[PDB]
Amino acid sequence: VSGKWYLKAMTKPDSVTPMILKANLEAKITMLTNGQCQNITVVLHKTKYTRVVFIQPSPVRDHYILYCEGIRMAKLLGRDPEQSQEALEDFREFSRAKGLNQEILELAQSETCSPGGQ
Ligand SMILES: [Ca+2]
């Protein structure tokens, strides 16, 4: 669960850069949001982690599913960028199976974020 990862879907972002999980666990995405850039860097510490976040394996080759409470959403991380309909279908069930049913948004993959006119 280390290295380049791709946040593929989620139950706001207009595009998203790759994810970098360093091992407490430490993630860095940068997120394109209405012509801005949100550079995130969230340490996850082991208590299910900490917001509160449960990482769980996906049933599918090369994918993981995140549940986090703190509003509650769900995310589908992948190890290679391409769309996996069968990874989605499972992320949907999981998402309804945990109380979340507000549009599986499948994310746009940019290699950089440049702010509007910045
Ligand atoms: Ca938008």
Summary keywords:
monomer; 118 residues; mainly beta; Lipocalin; 8-stranded antiparallel β-sheet; 3-stranded antiparallel β-sheet; 1 helix; 10% helix; binds calcium ion; transport protein; Odorant binding protein; monomeric; Major allergen Can f 1
Can you describe what's shown?
Its main location: secreted. Keywords: Allergen, Disulfide bond, Glycoprotein, Secreted, Signal, Transport. Belongs to the calycin superfamily. Lipocalin family. The structure is a monomer. By secondary structure, this protein is mainly beta. It has one helix spanning 85-96, and strands spanning 3-10, 15-16, 19-22, 25-28, 30-32, 37-39, 42-44, 52-57, 63-69, 72-78, 105-106. The chain has a single domain, classed as Lipocalin. The strands form two sheets. Strands 1, 3, 4, 7, 8, 9, 10 and 11 form an eight-stranded antiparallel sheet that branches. It binds calcium ion. Calcium ion (CA) binds next to loops.
Short description:
It is classed as transport protein. Helix content is 10%, strand content 42%. It is mainly beta and 118 residues long.
How many domains, in number, for the residues? Answer: 1
What's the total number of strands?
A: 11
Largest sheet: 8 strands, antiparallel
| Gap from first CA to last CA | 34 Å
Helix coverage percent: 10-25%
CATH class: Mainly Beta
DSSP summary: helix tally: 1
Bound molecules: calcium ion
From the coordinates shown, what is the CATH architecture? Beta Barrel
Radius of gyration: 14 Å
What string gives the helices and strands in order?
EEEEEEEEEEHE
What is the name of the CATH superfamily?
A: Calycin beta-barrel core domain
CATH fold call:
Lipocalin
Class from helix and strand fractions:
mainly beta
Q: How does the overall form come out from the CA principal axes?
A: globular
The share of residues in extended strands comes to 35-45%
Family: Belongs to the calycin superfamily. Lipocalin family.
GO cellular component, one term: extracellular space
Disulfide bonds: 37-113
Protein name: Major allergen Can f 1
